[PDB]
Amino acid sequence: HMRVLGLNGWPRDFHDASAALLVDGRIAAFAEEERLTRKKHGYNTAPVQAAAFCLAQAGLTVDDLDAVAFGWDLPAMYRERLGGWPHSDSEALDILLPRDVFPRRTDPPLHFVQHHLAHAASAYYFSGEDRGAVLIVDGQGEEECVTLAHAEGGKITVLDTVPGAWSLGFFYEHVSEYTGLGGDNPGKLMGLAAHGTTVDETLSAFAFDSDGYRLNLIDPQARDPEDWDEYSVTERAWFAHLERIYRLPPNEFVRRYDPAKGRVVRDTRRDPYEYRDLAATAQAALERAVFGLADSVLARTGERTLFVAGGVGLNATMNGKLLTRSTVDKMFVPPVASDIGVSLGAAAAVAVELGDRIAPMGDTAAWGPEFSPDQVRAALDRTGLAYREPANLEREVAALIASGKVVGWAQGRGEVGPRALGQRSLLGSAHSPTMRDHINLRVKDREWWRPFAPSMLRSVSDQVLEVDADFPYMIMTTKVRAAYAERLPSVVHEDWSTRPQTVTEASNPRYHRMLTELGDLVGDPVCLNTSFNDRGEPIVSSPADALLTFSRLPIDALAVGPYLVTKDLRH
């Protein structure tokens, strides 16, 4: 078997560090650095913890690897932007895989994979489809912000690219920053957009055409002479433009000592909800641009299957509108469409070059660490909390959810990507018309306007959803059928749209059993499934992380491995 370790993350100005290990084309392990370090977004680091976990999980050392692959062409970026690539392969490996954590006798072959090739590999090779059009829409790779390519016969061939100064991902991050949501939280902008109305989707900046878009605000060949990407140049141009054309100036961040918290805390000067029409208009602009790019690559390649990756591929609202287009029959977007996926993509590209066949992802993203009952018990015994070991944990959790309680669920291998998918989730009733406000305001103390989404059995999804297909990742919106347009108020929008996870018995037996039991109580085997964290931390990974979060949030119960902990309500 070939064993290839893919990596993302570097100590200089990088984000989304992660590591993925392919063994004979199968995902043996995959983790994001932030989940193990507890530092959101995996900034400015090699993926030391994630790679250490992957090797441990597989029972390997670096000497057992056939290759190490990195999801950017770093030598090219250093040569073009920083005056030269100074590292031998051995020196680069010492930075990526420091010897104090990764002892080795010799160096594995090191491969640098062009960033958009890594994104494209993370979609195509794991899709279960033998051919299709590839659309990569990113912030920026080494140079380009968009790649259109043709995936066929195991090969990916580039058709066209768009230069970085025209980035749709940077545009959307800059609007998110302008509204006060923050450029690091573009998912919040997508949720805010649902509450606004679009006036003029060009924003007096875009011109749209049947193949995509033009941006008249900035020279497409603009390059920052003092940086290695175009983010600061695009930021300056977009902030100036938005202040000219939109009725509100930028929201500002405010840092003030809060005596209730005993710390300086960051807030915004205005409520970001005031910018909802800008959010709606930016989302409409993004959608129209991407519809053109998607139509273009499908038409050029003669395909009707669309593979999307790059960070903009996390835009589930946009993805759902692509799926319904007359030009698209099938679509695949991996849960790791953002830069966290280029570790996996780089490993895949290299594994394919080495002659392996890559297995489909298969309706799960559960590749991170898991913990045995003894390991969970060790973490529980640290807290001193009382707990139970239910004879039928799934049936008890279903009854708690049916009654309107919120249950933390930490089971099996951690899912990868930004969405909880029944491995590290907070669960609540899909049928309750008060549950959305309860979890947004009482549990998470976040914005009232944030949406929630459901998990449901794949075996009922053809009845619940208008499309009979797998939706394993909560990465694509669709509509419910009439019979469910009012029954599921916490997880279905007024317009009947929803962003589902379908669950198969093979994908997640425990979660499947719990939803089955819940269906016997509330009629539909469907629940609300949100991230097990709050706004200030990554999704929990270890049993100790789950207990720490459980203890600070007014959650009713925690099902962690085979154990059930309930809030200590004795005065």
Sequence-separated (6 or more) residues with CB below 8 Å from residue 298: 133, 304, 306, 327, 328
321-380 residues in contact with Fe ion (CB under 5 A) are 339
Which of K ion, Fe ion, none has residue 568 at its interface (CB below 5 to 8 Å by kind)? K ion
Binding-site string for K ion from residue 357 to residue 396, where x marks contact by CB under 5 A and - marks none: ----------------------------------------
- The distance of closest approach from Cβ of residue 467 to K ion in the complex, given in angstroms and rounded to an integer, is 9
* Cβ nearer to Fe ion, comparing 147 with 508: 147
The closest of 132, 135, 85, 138 to 112, measured between CA atoms, is 85
In the region spanning residues 313 to 342, those forming contacts with K ion, defined by CB under 5 A, are 328
When CB distances are held under 5 to 8 angstroms depending on the partner's kind, the choice from K ion, Fe ion, none that residue 138 binds is Fe ion
Part of the chain binding Fe ion (CB under 5 A), chosen from 131-139, 143-151, 237-245, 324-332: 131-139
- d(CA 179, CA 172) in angstroms, rounded, equals 11
Closest alpha carbon to 396 in 562, 160, 165: 562
Angle at 123 between CA 122 and CA 128, to 5 degrees: 115
Min separation Cβ 326 and K ion, Å: 6
Task: Indicate if 512 belongs to the active site.
Answer: no
Q: Return the CA Rg of the chain.
A: 23
Tell me: is residue 315 an annotated ligand-binding position. Answer: yes
Q: How many residues bind Fe ion (CB under 5 A)?
A: 2
Q: Is 468 in the site for K ion (CB under 5 A)?
A: no
Rank residues 311 and 561 by Cβ distance to K ion and give the closer one. Answer: 561
- The position carrying tokens 């010492």 is 94
Q: Give min distance, CB of 343 to K ion, in A.
A: 31
Residues 6 or more apart whose Cβ sits within 8 Å of residue 558: 407, 408, 410, 546, 547, 550, 564, 565, 566
| Enclosing H/E stretch for 519 | helix 509-522
Q: Structure tokens of 388?
A: 């139970």
> Nearest-CB residue to K ion?
566
- Collapse the DSSP code of 480 into the 3-class scheme (helix H, G, I; strand E, B; otherwise coil) and give the result: strand
**Of 127, 311, 123, the residue nearest 231 (C-alpha):** 311
Q: Is 283 annotated as belonging to a binding site?
A: no
Q: What is the DSSP letter of 108?
A: P
Which residue spans within 407-541 are E strands per DSSP?
407-410, 424-429, 454-457, 478-479, 497-498, 501-503, 526-531
* CA gap 282, 212 in Å, rounded: 15
Q: Which of 161, 198, 202, 566 binds K ion (CB under 5 A)?
A: 566
To which H or E segment does residue 51 belong? helix 48-58
List the one residue from 33, 107, 138, 277 that touches Fe ion (CB under 5 A). Answer: 138
> Of these residues, 1, 15, 241, 493, which one is catalytic?
15
Residue choice 105, 260, 568, 571 for contact with K ion (CB under 5 A): 568
Residue 277 interacting partner from K ion, Fe ion, none (CB closer than 5 to 8 Å by kind): none
Closest by CA position to 216, among listed 191, 197, 238: 238
For residue 476, the minimal CB distance to K ion (Å) is 12
Catalytic residue numbers read 15
Residues near Fe ion (CB under 5 A) are: 138, 339
In the annotated binding site for carbamoyl phosphate, the residues are 419-420, 499, 529-531
- Residues at the site binding K ion, with contacts judged by CB under 5 A: 328, 566, 568
Question: Which residues make up each annotated binding site?
Answer: 13, 40, 115, 119, 138, 140, 169, 173, 229, 311, 315, 339, 419-420, 450, 499, 529-531
